[PDB]
Amino acid sequence: GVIGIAQ
Amino acid sequence: GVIGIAQ
Amino acid sequence: GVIGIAQ
Amino acid sequence: GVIGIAQ
Amino acid sequence: GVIGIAQ
Amino acid sequence: GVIGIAQ
Amino acid sequence: GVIGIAQ
Amino acid sequence: GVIGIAQ
Amino acid sequence: GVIGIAQ
Amino acid sequence: GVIGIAQ
């Protein structure tokens, strides 16, 4: 799977 | 699956 | 599945 | 899988 | 797998 | 605010 | 804020 | 803020 | 802030 | 801040 987080 | 979070 | 969250 | 985090 | 973190 | 998701 | 996801 | 993800 | 991920 | 990842 894929987890991506932009802050 | 895919989880993506933009802040 | 897909979860996407834009803030 | 893939985890990517941008701050 | 792949973990990448940009600060 | 608060967002919570249970699958 | 708070985001929490359980799979 | 807080982001937490359980798989 | 806090980011925590359990797989 | 704090980033923690358990695999």
Swiss-Prot record, chains A, B, C, D, E, F, G, H, I, J:
Entry protein name: Superoxide dismutase [Cu-Zn]
Oligomeric form and interacting partners: Homodimer; non-disulfide-linked. Heterodimer with SOD1. The heterodimer CCS:SOD1 interacts with SLC31A1; this heterotrimer is Cu(1+)-mediated and its maintenance is regulated through SOD1 activation. Interacts with DAOA; the interaction is direct.
Family: Belongs to the Cu-Zn superoxide dismutase family.
PTM characteristics: Such modification might only occur in extreme conditions and additional experimental evidence is required.
Record's function text: Destroys radicals which are normally produced within the cells and which are toxic to biological systems.
Annotated disease: Amyotrophic lateral sclerosis 1: A neurodegenerative disorder affecting upper motor neurons in the brain and lower motor neurons in the brain stem and spinal cord, resulting in fatal paralysis. Sensory abnormalities are absent. The pathologic hallmarks of the disease include pallor of the corticospinal tract due to loss of motor neurons, presence of ubiquitin-positive inclusions within surviving motor neurons, and deposition of pathologic aggregates. The etiology of amyotrophic lateral sclerosis is likely to be multifactorial, involving both genetic and environmental factors. Spastic tetraplegia and axial hypotonia, progressive: An autosomal recessive, neurologic disorder characterized by loss of motor abilities in the first year of life, after which severe, progressive spastic tetraparesis develops. Affected individuals have severe axial hypotonia, hyperekplexia, hypertonia, and myokymia, reflecting upper motor neuron involvement. Cognitive development may be affected.
Note: The protein (both wild-type and ALS1 variants) has a tendency to form fibrillar aggregates in the absence of the intramolecular disulfide bond or of bound zinc ions. These aggregates may have cytotoxic effects. Zinc binding promotes dimerization and stabilizes the native form.
Superkingdom per UniProt: Eukaryota
Record's subcellular location: Cytoplasm; Nucleus
Naturally occurring in which organism (per UniProt): Homo sapiens (Human)
